[PDB]
């Protein structure tokens, strides 16, 4: 009600696309599979989370596999940290010369965005609005 008339210097609007059910898991302080490698909200997140279904456009008959999520990271997520390193992690003694394999993984895996998905699992376009105040 008061978000219409509250002054914040900046709004961090983060736009992306994920699976349907995972939206409610994006909460201030909530932890999960995304809160450690892709995007974690700060423990003092004062804002909003919006998500709308886009199965009509973001789903292919043969399978829309253009969207990817990152699985591994060299460290745990701190409040509003962006690690986008494409260097393959070395989880053992095997040198990772740009190719896939055990202990040599490119951290990105494709989303299975297809019309077959149910409403709670359809591709949702999600925007997180994090308001900043001094």
């Amino acid at each position, epitope marked *: 009600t008061k978000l219409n008339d509250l002054c914040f210097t900046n709004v961090y609007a983060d736009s992306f696309v994920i699976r349907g059910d995972e939206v409610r898991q994006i909460a201030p302080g909530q932890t999960g599979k995304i809160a450690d490698y892709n995007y974690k909200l700060p423990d003092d997140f004062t804002g909003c989370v919006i998500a709308w279904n886009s199965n009509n456009l973001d789903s292919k008959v043969g399978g829309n596999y253009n969207y990817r999520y990152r*699985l591994f990271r060299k460290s745990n997520l701190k409040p509003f940290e962006r690690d986008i390193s494409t260097e393959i992690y070395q989880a053992g003694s095997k040198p990772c010369n740009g190719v896939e394999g055990f202990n040599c993984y490119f951290p990105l895996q494709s989303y299975g965005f297809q019309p077959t*998905n149910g409403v709670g699992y359809q591709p949702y376009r999600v925007v997180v609005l994090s308001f900043e105040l001094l």
Partner: antibody
Amino acid sequence: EVQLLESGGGLVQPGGSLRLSCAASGVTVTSNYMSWVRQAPGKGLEWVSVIYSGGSTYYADSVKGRFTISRHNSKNTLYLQMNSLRAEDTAVYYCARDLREAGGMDVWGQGTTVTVSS
Amino acid sequence: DIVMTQSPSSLSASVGDRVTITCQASQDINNYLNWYQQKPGKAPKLLIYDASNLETGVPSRFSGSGSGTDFTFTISSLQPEDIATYYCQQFDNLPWTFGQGTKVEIR
């Protein structure tokens, strides 16, 4: 080299606290997901609890407060205490690490049998 | 919330017979389905991932198909090494409710 061993359990009296230890080498406990699973003798799988990376512990509703979890970075090991264990919890316990959406939980650990029978 | 129960609960066949397993969920799951082999006594072992690619060790007789809620698993020739219980579950929404489980035993 990578190796996962377990310790803890026996034939202690009911109401006797115990402490399971999961010693893993070759991985990073701090930045990996892990779970505890108990299995009855001669039965199927039965999940118990989950630990995430960064200090986030959760269980099922029946085991809401079961565990007291701590870690030691000297040997990258987990210690996990239960106060006043329960009678039917006699089972083989496993600490497990799941890779999730890139092939899920291929190889299992050792698993130790704990009997809290009267 | 989401409870995922196997369509087959108890299937018994002989050596070399076809085995058909249906793995359905309450609603659509994607990329969160694995085909395991626990076996009596020994530690559980995952064999088939993503239902499309064969892993090192699994014979080519095993096949998987499906894109969406229902994934189907076919064994053309049952072997004594396949005496086991297949479990496919939803490891997405806690708590993890248990399924029926497809216990395949040879005769």
